[PDB]
Design an enzyme around this catalytic site. Structure first.
Site, PDB file in Angstrom:
ATOM      1  N   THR A   1      -1.403  -1.305   4.646  1.00 55.72           N
ATOM      2  CA  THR A   1      -2.256  -0.218   4.179  1.00 55.72           C
ATOM      3  C   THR A   1      -3.705  -0.557   4.505  1.00 55.72           C
ATOM      4  O   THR A   1      -4.004  -1.587   5.118  1.00 55.72           O
ATOM      5  CB  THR A   1      -2.080   0.026   2.674  1.00 55.72           C
ATOM      6  OG1 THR A   1      -2.840  -0.940   1.937  1.00 55.72           O
ATOM      7  CG2 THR A   1      -0.612  -0.064   2.273  1.00 55.72           C
ATOM      8  N   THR A   2      -4.613   0.320   4.088  1.00 57.70           N
ATOM      9  CA  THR A   2      -6.025   0.140   4.397  1.00 57.70           C
ATOM     10  C   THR A   2      -6.596  -1.034   3.610  1.00 57.70           C
ATOM     11  O   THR A   2      -6.459  -1.099   2.384  1.00 57.70           O
ATOM     12  CB  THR A   2      -6.806   1.414   4.080  1.00 57.70           C
ATOM     13  OG1 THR A   2      -6.695   1.712   2.682  1.00 57.70           O
ATOM     14  CG2 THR A   2      -6.277   2.588   4.893  1.00 57.70           C
TER      15      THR A   2
END
Lengths: 240, 216, 233, 193, 231, 119, 186, 227, 223
Positions: free
Chosen positions: B40-41
């Site tokens: 994910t980010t």
């Protein structure tokens, strides 16, 4: 070369020298008793008085558990006993891992004897100075108890003793012992022979420890005796 | 070299029992369940005398290497977790033996050698950074083992939006609160733009850190 | 020590270590073996403490394979280790042949191993002199007898252990060819009791036939020792 | 290929686990309608190995070996997180060619005050991806259907009978099922039609 | 006190000399390397009447075209014969022609002397007497533990070999035929046997020039060659 | 060359193990790379040391490592090998071969002593 | 080569297609009331089954006891897994036997070593057809003669469905602490 | 050439290790008390030259977050045992994800020490380690000897005049004692057998609290407890 | 010496007959197969001729034609004085392993003074052939001869096969020989009828110089 101890070497007549001296160490340790009863296997031991400040609670340095259905006790050097009991645990658990069954005690004592014989024969390292009293229960032959030594020999024993004053303990076991003996009678016999070996009339509760393996309800269960039940057993022993 | 054979025999390691069975199974043509891709980010930036990492979850991405070193992973969950545990405990053992403050450069070198030993098999991207005697340092480790001391880094699936926002709104000598605002301006925007969970903020000070898992 | 010649030649061309193994063997317990026709009775001296020791665990007439069997005298742990080696070797040989292991091959292998321990560094001699009994590939009963020196030779009626020479002389004087099963067991019991106190508890005689090693019951042993006691007077 | 679907539910001082029973090879060809997937590692540890039956048996016996070694060496009771990281390390030991089960760890936290009992649940991936859920958690090849009822039927703290009703109603895979409800002072195993 | 490899003050290995002290203790064996072949014989020292006299044989076959006689330590000698026949059949595998006697005794010698680090620990206390036929006729060889192998016209080994070698020196002559070699060997044996020369108390193996086969003589042949002896 | 050496041993099928599919060719796969994971690293270290400092350093290192490794228990019970860890300077480091574990089955202890040190 | 096996109250029966039509490379009689039936290549069978049988012989002889059937099944499972590790070839396994602890029993194991206890097991090319009949006609409290009748009907079904003719089978039977062998042709 | 130099002598007794115990008899005292609210370890560090940095010569070291260690012997064996004990602690941590229990680490160190006593061509160690720690199973204080035997001690002293120090500790020790009273008894026992004037920089005191990490008390704290 | 070993180690500058070399390619077991994709002139090994062996009342008949590149290659090897081995498939592989089996049998007969069984020789040959299975190995052999357990006709192949029987034939066109033999065969056949049947079946095999040998309880003749 000139500093070689030459452990794995026969004597002039017939014997391995170091193996004798190892046996003498077995003759210079606290006495350990082993019994067979009709409802369990009893194995007491005598605690050497290192000091009064030793933590008596949960410091059973004589008897140890190798597996859920096997235990043992030592009458020699405790440092060697720890490693040898660890290897016995490893072999028992590996047998349960491979074959998916509880270890027969005969195989386990054969393997620990193979350890002690490998140190007896192979290499030049000194032999293992400790003798065990492996005993337990299996479906093959019921209750069993054995007596290993540094030389690798082993044999079964309905009742036996090792350590200091082992002759007196063997003499006491020879007279007062029966096949159809209940657990309480075996415990009282253990108290009697321990007191006879220690030369005291009244056994001291702090100076001894006991254990047994009951097979009630088709399930193995080891119980190690603590101070309160030891005091109760001694009180019942003196009153009979 | 016989002693190394003895060391290999005595000690354990990576067992390889079931290679052939898996080869037969994959050749026979059956689909097997997929890996947990927790990528994910994640981002971080070198603020005023303190690193400020960022990530998003309820898998807490912010992992602990030392009292002044945190990190955020992106890739396979098991690889990241085990490598992070190994790095944290290696640095702890070094700190116990040497009795000195942990350094980010030692972590960077160890991670670089460990990831370079496994060329691409270990999907493992880490944005490790923290404060040491040489000030704050942020790094951009890749799965091929190529560290780089950048002023700000943004990795993950939605890394493009976070990197663009950071490049737009990064300045030197920034305040810690402004650093947290920029961290959300990267991570929160990347969450709502890219195809989740709760953001994570943790300022990496030289001493007395603080973790904010319910950041937003 | 590791890579160190424990056994070496003496000034008078003798291996003193192998000699020490020989009197170590002689100090061990007795064991007698007879052969006739297609079977071979085997007996060992039993030593147990009454009322404490378990006779069941103390086993001496082990079976190595389907046919061959081994008795021993001297070090028990050394015997157990060499027994494990010989059993594993018998299963190796039966894997390659898919036929039972003859007595001659395993006797030669035991001789080879006992020679190897008298010629390798960091290994002492095996302190036993095992004697194997079984059927060859020709299916004829034969008995061999190894020693710590690794020398082996076929035998018709041989004994080992303490006071071995007296039993050997008695068997050489009294042994006949093509005897019956009862006659063979009686001769083996008399031979072992020539140098052992006459009691039922000190013998565990068993008869080896092509089916198996059948252990003789206690009642038969009691009857035979009582008969020998009657015949002595 | 011997697939299944395991399930776990928490509540007030009680935790329940459930599993289907199906073993079969050759994609879709049943060969046994009763195979163990739930294994009682300890009085307070139950593992829900679901996947290929050979990997279930192998990982179960490896875990039994290691846990028995720890218990005999420690000579005392074992913590659930020790078993969890043990399983994670064993799974990562085959980083290449893993064990092909989807394990689920269920246990009880024992806070020695006398002793306080708390739930403990966590899911795992093919490599070992420990997440501390502490609510409902689901794992299995057919977990995609099960997530719906797992999220819908959650109640928070429940009575043991209510927990059994909820997990039973919520519960390559099939052929009956079993439910083991764990409590601090009892355990109840029961099969569902 | 000292290692397995330590020179004496006279430049002689102690262990080699002790090995040469052990080969004297053993059973008598005699061989004649006449032009027709080799007549390697033995004693059959019977320990007792209970000996089966089938598994205890001194004359072994290293190969079909090779014969030998063992002395000294017996298990060691069996190991020597086993290695010798193993490498002989290996030579047969690599090379079509049967192995010569000379190369076989080199393999035996380098087996015997490998005890020094130059695994085996101590020297092989054995004194073999290898003999056989190859393309250049019969050849008789010898290998003491010191490794100084040397071929012989006729030789004797074992205990009380002094009388045997003296009588062989006092009776052997060139161009002796095979029957003359047989009766010479039996006479030497009987004049070094302590007991009487019965049929079953002797073992003889012959490798003839034409046949080139290891024929161990049976009871009838032994009886015939005993009967044809002189007074 | 490779694949051991035939010697008419006659014992090809054992009752403890079966031959591998590759015998001893050792085809390059992930297990082969992980097998030579520590030997190659120490080869690189000895290369660096005996290059820059002199081959006597590599000689001293190898003899010290063999001597401390020679000081260990017999095969069977696992040896701590602490002195080897001090000499090789891996005591400060914890690595994959330290943690994890392999459980290991059919060979008697005496066969292991024969296999380990050639008796 | 199809393999079939049935177990119930006091019987165990195993059958396989002997095919030369006198294939002795399938069945292996372990010492005591135990048998190992295997399927696959002839060399793979003769290697693996011999390895298992000689190992069990070593275990029983070196301890002077009888291996329990559950231990033999799990040991064969482990050795099958190790063998597949060292030889990438398929081998089917059908362990069955008798033990004093739990009476008679049968086990079913594939090349994947996905071993499990079953009352009705099938392997090989004809596994699908025979399994339907065993599911349909098997019932509790079955006597051995009717079990052989089910196996005869399965042999007839395999004869009818496929183009094979003059097909032969060998039946191994365990009951009453006795092992029996027969050669049925249908 | 591998042989054991620690060989069973006549009449047993395993004499070589006993010589190591004489070194343990010739070393400075290093005691420790297991209190009801923690565990204490104390030692007498000397001032041989008066130019030594007191911080540099550590004797009471830390292995884990709740495990200390003190010894009485030569310093190199303490250093290598400490390093291997730490490596085993992190090994347990990666294996199981928790702080290593005191009993497991004590057993491992006992096995290593016995290994070195038994291993060919290496002498035994020359120190008596004194492990202490806190875990879910409460407080712990063990003592690994050169022989490898481990004893579950409650209050013990090792070094010069260890018998008199243990007798003095036993005379004024109870099961229920506070951490402050335990520290005062430790200071009194150290001052009983010093052969001089005890003051700052001559002792080091380490304490592991019921919940706090194992902290080594600073010089100012030791001076405050001295008064 | 150790000095030269360490010198070659730092400088990065690094063969008995019975040792077998292998390729350094990623998968040596398929290496020859990969080479067979590149060309086939090298991998054109001399293939053996079909063999026909069978028991009858007095002994065993073993017939084989001569057709390889060559047409006068002997196809039968003397494993033992009573055991005769056949050759089919790759000539080199079966020839070399037949010779090596004969050497093993000679060692066994020497140390263990007893004649080996045909079952034992077949098992040994099958084991060593299986030892190098997967590396690429073509060999068809029909062990045939007398032993103390009567006559034996064991058949072994590269894949570890071991099948006992009374009728066997391997090689190219072996199905035609099996067809003729099943058309006409009887255990209680005369020697002349048996050799005539063998010659007719071999001639049928190599149509769509025959050499025949008769093995008897005291060796084998060459007719």
């Amino acid at each position: 070369r000139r500093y070689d101890s030459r452990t794995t070497t026969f004597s002039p007549e017939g014997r391995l020298y170091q193996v004798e001296y190892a046996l003498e160490a077995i003759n210079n340790a606290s006495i350990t008793i082993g019994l067979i009863t009709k409802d369990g296997v009893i194995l007491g031991a005598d605690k050497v008085f290192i000091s009064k400040l030793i933590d008596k609670a949960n410091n059973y340095e004589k008897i140890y558990k190798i597996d859920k259905h096997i235990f043992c006790g030592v009458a020699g050097l405790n440092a060697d006993a720890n490693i040898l009991i660890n290897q016995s645990r490893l072999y028992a658990q590996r047998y349960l891992y491979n074959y998916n069954e509880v270890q027969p005690v005969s195989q386990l004592v054969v393997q620990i004897c193979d350890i002690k014989q490998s140190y007896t024969q192979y290499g030049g390292l000194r032999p293992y100075g400790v003798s065990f009293l492996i005993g337990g229960y299996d479906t093959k032959d019921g209750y069993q108890l054995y007596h290993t030594d540094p030389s690798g020999n082993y044999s079964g024993w309905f009742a036996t003793a090792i350590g200091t004053n082992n002759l007196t303990a063997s003499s006491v076991l020879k007279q007062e012992w029966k096949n159809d003996m209940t657990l309480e009678e075996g415990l009282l016999l253990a108290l009697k022979t321990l007191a006879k070996s220690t030369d005291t009339e009244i056994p001291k509760s702090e100076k001894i420890e006991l254990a047994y393996l009951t097979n009630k309800d088709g399930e193995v269960y080891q119980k190690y005796l603590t101070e309160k039940e030891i005091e109760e057993l001694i009180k019942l022993y003196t009153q009979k | 070299l016989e002693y190394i054979n003895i060391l290999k025999e005595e000690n354990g390691g990576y067992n390889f029992d079931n290679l052939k069975r898996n080869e037969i199974l994959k050749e026979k043509g059956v689909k097997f369940p997929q890996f947990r891709k927790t990528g994910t980010t994640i981002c971080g930036l070198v603020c005023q005398n303190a690193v400020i990492l960022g990530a998003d979850t309820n898998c807490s991405k912010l992992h602990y290497i030392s009292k002044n070193i945190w990190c955020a992973g992106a890739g396979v969950a098991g690889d990241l977790e085990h490598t992070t545990l190994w790095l944290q405990h290696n640095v702890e053992l070094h700190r116990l033996n040497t009795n000195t403050q942990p350094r980010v450069s030692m972590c960077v070198s160890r991670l670089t050698q460990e990831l370079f030993k496994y060329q691409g098999y270990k999907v493992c991207a880490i944005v490790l950074g923290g404060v040491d005697v040489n000030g704050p340092q942020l790094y951009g480790i890749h799965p091929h083992g190529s560290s780089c001391l950048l002023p700000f880094t943004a990795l993950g699936s939605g890394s493009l939006n976070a990197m663009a926002v950071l490049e737009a709104k990064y300045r030197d000598n920034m305040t810690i609160e402004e650093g947290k605002n920029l961290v959300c301006e990267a991570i929160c925007a990347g969450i709502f733009n890219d195809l989740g969970g709760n953001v994570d903020i943790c300022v990496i000070t030289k001493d007395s850190y603080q973790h904010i898992r319910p950041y937003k | 020590s590791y890579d160190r010649a424990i056994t070496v030649f003496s000034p008078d061309g003798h291996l003193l270590q192998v000699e020490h193994a020989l009197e170590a063997v002689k100090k061990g317990g007795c064991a007698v073996a007879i052969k006739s026709s297609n079977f071979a009775v085997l007996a060992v001296e039993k030593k147990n403490i009454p009322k404490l020791q378990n006779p069941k665990t103390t086993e001496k007439l082990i079976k190595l394979d389907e046919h061959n069997c081994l008795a021993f005298a001297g070090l028990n742990a050394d015997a157990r280790v060499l027994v494990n080696k010989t059993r594993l070797e018998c299963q190796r040989y039966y894997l390659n042949m898919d036929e039972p292991a003859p007595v001659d091959y395993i006797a030669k292998y035991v001789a080879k191993v006992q020679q190897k321990f008298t010629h390798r560094g960091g290994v002492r001699p095996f302190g036993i002199a095992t004697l194997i009994a079984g059927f060859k590939n020709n299916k004829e009963i034969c008995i061999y007898q190894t020693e710590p020196s690794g020398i082996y030779a076929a035998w018709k009626a041989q004994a080992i252990g303490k006071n071995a020479k007296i039993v050997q002389e008695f068997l050489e004087k009294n042994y006949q060819e093509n005897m019956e099963q009862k006659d063979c067991i009686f001769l083996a019991l008399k031979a072992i009791f020539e140098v052992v106190e006459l009691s039922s508890k000190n013998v565990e005689v068993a008869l080896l036939t092509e089916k198996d090693l059948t252990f003789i019951e206690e009642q038969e042993i009691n009857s035979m020792v009582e008969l020998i006691d009657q015949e002595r007077t | 290929y011997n697939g299944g679907c395991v399930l776990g539910m928490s509540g007030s001082n009680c935790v329940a686990i459930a599993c289907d029973l199906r073993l079969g090879a050759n994609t879709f060809t049943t060969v046994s309608t009763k195979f163990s997937k739930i294994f009682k590692m300890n009085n307070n540890v139950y593992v829900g190995l679901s996947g290929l039956a050979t990997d279930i048996q192998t990982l179960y016996e490896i875990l039994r070996y290691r846990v028995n070694l720890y218990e005999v060496r420690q000579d005392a009771e074992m913590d659930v997180e020790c078993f969890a990281n043990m399983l994670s390390s064993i799974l990562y030991s085959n980083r290449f060619s893993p064990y092909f089960v989807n394990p689920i760890v269920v246990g009880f936290k024992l806070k020695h005050y006398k002793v306080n009992y708390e739930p403990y649940l966590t899911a795992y991936d093919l490599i070992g991806a420990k997440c501390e859920t502490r609510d409902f958690v689901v794992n299995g090849v057919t977990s995609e259907q099960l997530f719906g009822m797992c999220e819908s039927l959650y109640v928070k703290d429940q009575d043991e009978n209510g927990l059994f009703e909820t997990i039973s109603q919520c519960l390559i895979s099939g052929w009956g099922a079993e439910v083991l409800v764990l409590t601090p002072e009892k355990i109840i195993k029961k099969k569902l039609k | 006190d000292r290692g397995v490899n330590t020179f004496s003050p006279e430049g002689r290995l102690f262990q080699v000399e002790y090995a040469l002290g052990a080969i004297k203790l053993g059973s008598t064996a005699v061989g004649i390397c006449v032009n027709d072949g080799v007549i390697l014989a033995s004693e059959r020292r019977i320990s007792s009447t209970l000996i089966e006299k089938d598994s205890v044989e001194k004359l072994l076959s290293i190969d079909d075209h090779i014969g030998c006689a063992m002395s000294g330590l017996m298990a060691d000698a069996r190991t020597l014969i086993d290695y010798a026949r193993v490498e002989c059949n290996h030579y047969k595998f690599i090379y079509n022609e049967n192995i010569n006697i000379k190369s076989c005794v080199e393999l035996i010698s380098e087996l015997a002397l490998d005890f020094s680090n130059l695994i085996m620990s101590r020297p092989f206390g054995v004194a073999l007497l290898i003999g056989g036929v190859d393309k250049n006729g019969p050849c008789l060889w010898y290998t003491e533990p010191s490794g100084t192998n040397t071929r012989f016209s006729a030789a004797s080994i074992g205990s009380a070999q002094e009388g045997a070698e003296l009588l062989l020196q006092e009776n052997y002559k060139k161009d002796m035929t095979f029957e003359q070699a047989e009766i010479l060997a039996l006479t030497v044996l009987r004049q070094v046997m302590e007991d009487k020369l019965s049929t079953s108390n002797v073992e003889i193996c012959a490798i003839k020039k034409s046949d080139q086969t290891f024929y161990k003589y049976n009871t009838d042949d032994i009886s015939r060659i005993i009967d044809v002896l002189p007074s | 060359n490779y694949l051991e050496k035939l010697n008419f041993d006659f014992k090809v099928k054992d009752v403890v193990s079966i031959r591998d599919i590759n015998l001893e060719g050792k085809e390059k796969n992930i297990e082969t790379f992980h097998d030579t994971i520590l030997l190659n690293e120490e080869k690189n270290f000895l290369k660096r040391t005996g290059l820059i400092y002199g081959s006597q350093e590599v000689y001293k290192n190898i003899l010290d490592r063999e001597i401390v490794s020679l000081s260990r228990r017999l095969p069977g019970i696992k040896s701590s090998l602490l002195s080897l860890d001090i000499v090789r300077n891996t005591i400060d480091r914890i690595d994959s071969y330290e943690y994890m574990e392999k459980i290991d089955p059919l060979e008697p202890l005496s066969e292991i002593i024969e296999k380990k040190m050639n008796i | 080569d199809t393999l079939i096996g049935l177990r119930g109250n006091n019987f165990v029966v195993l059958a396989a297609d002997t095919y030369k039509n006198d294939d002795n490379t399938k069945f292996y009689d372990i010492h005591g009331n135990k048998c190992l039936l295997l399927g696959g290549s002839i060399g793979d069978r003769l290697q693996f089954g011999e390895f298992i049988r000689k190992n069990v012989h070593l275990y029983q002889y070196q301890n002077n006891t009888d291996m329990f059937v559950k231990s033999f099944a799990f040991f064969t499972r482990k050795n099958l897994a190790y063998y597949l590790r060292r030889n990438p070839f398929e081998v089917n396994c059908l362990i069955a036997g008798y033990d004093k602890k739990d009476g008679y029993q049968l086990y079913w194991c594939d090349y994947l070593s996905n071993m499990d206890s079953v009352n009705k097991g099938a392997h090989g090319y004809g596994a699908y057809l025979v399994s339907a009949i065993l599911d349909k006609y098997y019932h509790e409290n079955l006597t051995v003669d009717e079990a052989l009748d089910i196996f005869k009907l399965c042999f007839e079904e395999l004869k009818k469905r496929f183009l094979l003719t003059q097909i032969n089978y060998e039946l191994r039977i365990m009951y009453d602490n006795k092992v029996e062998t027969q050669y049925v042709t249908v | 050439y591998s042989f054991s130099l620690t060989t069973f002598s006549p009449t047993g007794k395993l004499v070589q290790i006993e010589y190591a115990l004489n070194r343990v008899s010739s070393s400075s005292p290093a005691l420790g008390i297991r209190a009801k609210n923690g565990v204490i370890i104390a030692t007498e560090k000397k001032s041989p030259n008066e130019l030594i940095e007191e911080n540099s010569i550590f004797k009471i070291q830390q292995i884990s977050e709740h495990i200390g260690i003190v010894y009485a012997g030569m310093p190199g064996d303490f250093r290598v045992l400490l390093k291997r004990a730490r490596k085993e602690a992190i090994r347990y941590s990666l294996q199981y994800g928790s702080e290593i229990l005191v009993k497991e680490l004590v057993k491992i160190i006992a096995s290593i020490v016995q290994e070195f006593t038994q291993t060919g061509g290496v002498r035994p160690f020359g120190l008596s380690l004194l492990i202490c720690g806190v875990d879910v199973y409460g407080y712990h204080l063990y003592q690994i000897d050169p022989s490898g035997c481990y004893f579950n001690w409650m209050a013990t002293c090792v070094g010069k005049d260890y018998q008199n120090n243990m007798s003095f500790l036993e005379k004024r020790y109870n099961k229920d004692i506070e951490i402050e009273d335990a520290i005062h008894t430790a200071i009194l026992t150290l001052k009983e057998s010093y052969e001089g004037v005890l003051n700052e920089k001559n002792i080091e005191i380490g304490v592991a609290y019921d919940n706090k990490p194992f902290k080594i008390l600073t010089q100012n704290e030791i001076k405050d407890y001295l008064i | 010496s150790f000095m030269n070993e360490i010198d070659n180690l730092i400088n990065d500058v690094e063969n008995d007959e019975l040792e077998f070399c292998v390729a350094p390619v990623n998968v040596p077991r398929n290496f020859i197969k990969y080479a067979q994709t590149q060309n086939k002139k090298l991998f054109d090994f001399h293939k053996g001729t079909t063999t026909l062996a069978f028991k009858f009342k007095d002994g065993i008949i073993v017939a084989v034609d001569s057709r390889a590149s060559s047409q006068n290659v002997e196809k039968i090897i003397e494993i033992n004085k009573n055991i005769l081995g056949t050759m089919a498939g790759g000539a080199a592989d079966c020839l070399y392993w037949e010779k090596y089996l004969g050497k093993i049998i000679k060692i066994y007969e020497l140390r263990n003074n007893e004649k080996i069984s045909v079952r034992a020789a077949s098992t040994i040959l099958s084991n060593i052939l299986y030892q190098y299975k997967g590396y690429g190995l073509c060999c068809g052999i029909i062990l045939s001869g007398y032993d103390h357990t009567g006559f034996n006709m064991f058949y072994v192949d590269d894949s570890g096969k071991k099948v006992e029987g009374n009728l066997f034939s391997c090689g190219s066109g072996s199905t035609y020989a099996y067809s003729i033999l099943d058309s006409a065969y009887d255990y209680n056949l005369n020697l002349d009828q048996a050799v005539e049947l063998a010659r007719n079946a071999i001639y049928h095999a190599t149509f769509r110089k025959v050499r025949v040998f008769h093995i008897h309880k005291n060796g084998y003749d060459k007719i």
